[PDB]
Write a protein that binds this ligand. Structure first.
Ligand SMILES: Nc1ncnc2c1ncn2[C@@H]1O[C@H](CSCC[C@H](N)C(=O)O)[C@@H](O)[C@H]1O
Length: 288
DNA sequence: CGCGTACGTGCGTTTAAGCGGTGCTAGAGCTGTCTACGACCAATTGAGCGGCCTCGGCACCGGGATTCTCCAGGGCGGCCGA
């Protein structure tokens, strides 16, 4: 599909003597997957600012990052003054809530409802955190969304962000079936999925003991995908974290139920997919 | 109103009820003898019943513990549908 045409801006590599840690703005953070991947790659983080509403996700971040995260409330409360007073950013990330962007809803409300239009909030903060002309600072940005969108919606998003959406499927690097569009200007945006041997490709490596995988991988019949003691059992939450690439026992931070952990892990990013995406940032920024 | 199961019908098979015989004998049934067991009569007396009394066991008011009843809330999926 060639509807628009624009070259991706490739920044020159900075040497090690002018190497600086990253300043990261994370708009729709949720479960703090971005800072988790950044800490796993061994990258020094000078400032991480997450604008999260949901208190369970804020609790996930406060437990798993120990007060490193600077919290904002709603993204509508962020102005241009808040962007220009919190220093210039080096990495902007986010994925808008796809309640009305997904075409799996028969009665979907579209891009221009209060769940979808938050994307434009992103664009506004994309417009504020972007450096002006004449500044050769390497500025990188990343937007995530689902594959189940309309043609006009994806076309308008691609025109607004001015980048080619690469499609990445979790089955090439992890044990999940979800294809996601990624807008951004990272180097090697469409390079193939370098599967890490430490990543759990099959489903059975993500299971616990005493459980047999019925399928080869899981999706995002009135049965259950795991047999347990010759009985079909629901897929566990820690096993869901191992499928989604998270560390073991990650989203157990408060007194939330099983349904809350499902709602948090469903909306979260895939750790291996991000690790692939954030990989070339290591040569552009600080290392630890 | 739907599921099923288990009962009724029919046919073949066969077990034994019924009828017809006789032989025998334990026992129902009738007869004579008498004896011992109960009705009938009087005296007597002591046990049982009318009357009384007093008192303690039962009925009853009140209070607290308790003991079951029931509904409100908190968490919990869960179920969608707008
Ligand atoms: N107006 C808003 N501003 C900021 N966050 C919001 C928001 N509305 C909802 N959110 C929260 O932000 C998250 C966006 S949903 C997708 C999250 C993202 N893909 C991830 O990496 O986890 C949701 O968890 C939702 O609870």
């Amino acid at each position: 599909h060639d509807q628009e045409f624009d070259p991706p801006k490739v920044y020159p590599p900075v040497p090690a003597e002018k190497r600086k840690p990253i300043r990261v703005l994370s708009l729709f953070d949720g479960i703090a997957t971005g800072l988790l991947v950044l800490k796993d790659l061994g990258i020094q983080v000078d400032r991480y600012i997450a604008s999260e509403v949901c208190e369970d996700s804020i609790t996930v971040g406060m437990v798993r990052h120990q007060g490193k995260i600077m919290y904002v409330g709603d993204v509508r409360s962020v102005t241009q003054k808040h962007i220009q007073e919190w220093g210039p950013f080096d990495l902007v990330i986010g994925g808008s809530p796809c309640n009305d962007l997904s075409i799996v809803n028969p009665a979907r409300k579209g891009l221009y409802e209060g769940t979808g239009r938050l994307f434009f909030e992103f664009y506004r903060l994309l417009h504020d955190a972007r450096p002006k002309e004449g500044d050769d600072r390497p500025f990188f940005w990343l937007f995530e969304n689902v594959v189940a969108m309309g043609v006009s919606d994806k076309r308008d998003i691609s025109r607004f962000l001015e980048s080619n959406p690469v499609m990445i499927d979790a089955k090439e690097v992890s044990a999940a079936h979800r294809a996601r569009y990624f807008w951004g200007n990272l180097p090697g945006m469409n390079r193939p999925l370098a599967s890490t041997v430490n990543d759990k490709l099959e489903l059975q490596e993500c299971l616990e003991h005493g459980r047999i995988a019925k399928f080869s991988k899981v999706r995002t019949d009135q049965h259950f995908p795991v047999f347990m003691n010759e009985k079909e059992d629901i897929l566990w939450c820690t096993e869901m974290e191992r499928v989604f690439g998270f560390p073991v026992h990650y989203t157990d931070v408060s007194n939330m139920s099983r349904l809350a952990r499902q709602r948090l892990l469903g909306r979260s990013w895939s750790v291996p997919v991000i690790r692939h995406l954030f990989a070339p940032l290591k040569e552009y920024f600080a290392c630890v």
